[PDB]
Structure formats: C-alpha cells, structure tokens
Design a protein around this ligand. Structure first.
Ligand SMILES: O=C(O)c1ccccc1O
Ligand SMILES: [Cl-]
Ligand SMILES: [Cu+]
Ligand code: NA
Length: 370
C-alpha cells in the first residue's frame, strides 16, 4: 500500500528535549504514482510546554494546522512584525521565506502542528534557514566571512563570535515563565491592520460544516473563500466522524487529498485502477493518530471510525478550485441525478428496482458504520 504513510515512516530532521520535527519522504521516492504531488511535503512539529523555536524561515510556502494545544506564532519581515495566537484547529498560512518562531506558552500541554509545505523551486525540496542560533542549530550567519560580518554589523569580530557561539540547545528550547509572559504581553498589543498584510489564523470548525448528519461533519476552508489559500490552490478540510460512524463512499472530482489523523482510530477502503479491461484494486488499511493517507482525486473512498472515539482528520486538498464530493450512496448522491433508463441500462436491472435499492438509505453523508 503506497498510499498510507504511518507516523513511524516519517523522518526526524531534529529532535531536542523540548520539541521535534518529523517530515514525510518526498512522495516520488515512495512511488512514481505520486508525480502529481511531488511539490508537496507534510510534516508534524511538536513543542513541549514552555518552549520556543529558534527563528528560521522555510523556503517553501507553509500551512500550519494546530492539532493539539495552544501557542503563539511570530513573524518577522523586513517591513512588518506580527504575533498571532494559535488554538486547536486554527489554520495559518505563512508565506515562503518569512522568518518565524513559535512559543508554546502552556505549562502542561504539548503544542502539535501539522504542516503542509509547497515548494516554489525544485519540486518537493524543503529546508529551514536558521537566522537564530549559533552552534546548534547552526546559524547561517556563520557562513559569512568575519571580514564581511564585521563590516555588515559595524562591530568587532569578538562580539560576533560570542553572538553566534553560545546557542547549543538545538532548534526548540526552554523559555522561562517570565520570558513567556513578556512575549505574551508583546503579542497582546494592538497593531494597525493594513491591506496587503499577512492574514491571521482561521478556525476550521467555525460556522457551518459544508455537510453533516447525526453521524458526522465535514468542514472546509476553500481557496474560493480564503485568500491565504487561493494562490496555492489549496483547500483545508476537516472530517469529524462520530464514534461508530462512517462517511458514505464518495470521490473528490478534482482534488487529491493529503489526509492526516488528528484524533481517534479508524480504517479505510479505496478503489484504485492504478489493453485488458479496467480493474479496481481494493486499497485498505487502518488509521492512527499522526498517520498520513494520500487520497488521489477521482478515487472512491470510505473511512470508518473504530474504537471508542470520534475519528477526526484534516486533509490538505491540492488543485482544489471547484472540487466537489460525489457521494456514491445515501439520499443525496450522484444517482439522484441519473434517470431511470440510465440506471436500468447501467446495471441490467429493471429501473424501478435500481431506484428502490438506491433509496433504501434515507440518511446522507455519514451513517452508522459496520
Ligand atoms: O476532503 C476529503 O476528502 C478529506 C478526507 C478526509 C479528511 C479530510 C478531508 O479534507
Ligand atoms: Cl433490464
Ligand atoms: Cu489509483
Ligand atoms: Na436493459
């Protein structure tokens, strides 16, 4: 099964006592089937209580989704400073090359963010550039010659050796309660909101889901409605399947989805046709917290919640503009927009009987699972 990337298969670019980054392999290293998603990476960042990330920029465009906890993100640009508060299920776009850091200000709970990265240059390559730090993480200022740094900073070499030579604790480090309180104060300060500014986070569970029943909900932030997604042609979806529920089988017309488990457990089945006559392989598996599943566009799929909790999933939708979900069963489904004769011809069954079978399910979207 090339579609399922267990959390264990993720690579760990850094790990400290205060945090870690896990990132998926370039999808094209797994399979040539993934040439369509070559520009994209998925990562998980975790911060321990009272932690701070050394300032750095990512060369890729980034979307962060808060999976667990609470915190702050700050952004330092040439001509602007931002602070935003991050809560569970908030989503935040960070422009490529923006210098950022995070703070987990909570004393007890980890802050866990799931990350989509879209490359701009070579497909799928993603790198952090530590402006902060010194020895570990290595600051990029150490790449420049001393004669250059001295002129640039108008300072003697010995002050610069001290400046870039004392950080050794790695990319995520402890911050004191007091340091945190002071950053919290700077973050709560009112600013002048301009046009052209980086936009703050939006809650994915805000307002009305795109569809629901008693057994689940699908929320989505589409690129049509969110300018900070529009230029990447990305949608962010949130699937909340009630304990013991399922989503009815469906396909996305246009948009391949990179699906990460937030909470709970489940399983899935997908149909995949990837000259003799077309055959659809059964792609099947289980899902745990932190797993990634690639759901290619046009592929029929169902997710089943298993265990004693809801199955909660976030999906990064690519090529998302005008995407729709075609449901394959339930009251509201594609066959409602097919007339009798075509049902009859299609299944070689008298048409009224096809209608009867297709209308037995009075519920839509989500139902009691097997
Ligand atoms: O949009 C999807 O098909 C999807 C599926 C599972 C989880 C989140 C999602 O956005
Ligand atoms: Cl017939
Ligand atoms: Cu396929
Ligand atoms: Na017929």
């Amino acid at each position: 099964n090339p579609y399922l990337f267990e959390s264990a298969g993720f690579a760990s670019a850094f790990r400290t006592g205060e945090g870690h980054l896990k990132i998926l392999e370039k999808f094209t290293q797994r399979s040539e089937l993934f040439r369509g998603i070559e520009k994209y990476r998925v990562a998980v960042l975790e911060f321990e209580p009272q932690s701070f990330m050394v300032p750095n920029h990512c060369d890729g465009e980034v979307i962060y989704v808060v999976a667990k906890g609470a915190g702050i993100i700050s952004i330092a640009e040439q001509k602007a400073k931002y602070y935003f508060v991050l809560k569970k299920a908030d989503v935040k776009r960070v422009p490529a090359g923006a210098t950022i850091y995070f703070v987990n200000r909570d004393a007890n709970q980890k802050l866990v963010v799931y990350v989509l990265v879209k490359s701009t240059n070579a497909p799928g390559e993603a790198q952090e550039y530590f402006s902060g730090g010194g020895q570990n993480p290595e600051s990029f200022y150490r790449a420049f010659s001393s004669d250059i740094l001295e002129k640039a900073f108008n300072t003697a070499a010995d002050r610069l050796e001290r400046l870039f030579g004392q950080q050794k604790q790695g990319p995520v480090i402890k911050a004191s309660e007091e340091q945190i309180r002071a950053i919290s104060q700077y973050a709560s300060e009112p600013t002048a909101a301009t046009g052209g500014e980086i936009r703050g986070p939006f809650n994915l569970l805000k307002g009305a889901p795109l569809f629901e029943s008693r057994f689940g909900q699908f929320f989505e932030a589409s690129p049509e409605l969110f300018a900070q997604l529009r230029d990447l042609d990305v949608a962010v979806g949130y699937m909340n399947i009630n304990q013991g529920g399922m989503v009815l089988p469906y396909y996305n017309t246009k948009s391949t989805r990179l699906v990460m488990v937030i909470e709970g457990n489940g399983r899935f089945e997908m149909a995949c046709p990837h000259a003799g006559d077309v055959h659809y392989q059964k792609v099947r598996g289980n899902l745990n917290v932190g797993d990634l599943l690639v759901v290619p566009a046009a592929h029929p799929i169902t997710f089943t919640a298993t265990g004693g909790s809801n199955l909660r999933m976030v999906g990064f939708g690519i090529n998302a503009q005008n995407n729709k979900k075609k449901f394959l069963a339930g009251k509201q489904n594609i066959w409602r927009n097919v007339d009798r004769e075509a049902k009859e011809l299609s299944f070689n069954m008298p048409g009224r009987e096809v209608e009867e079978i297709f209308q037995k399910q009075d519920e839509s979207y989500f139902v009691a699972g097997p």
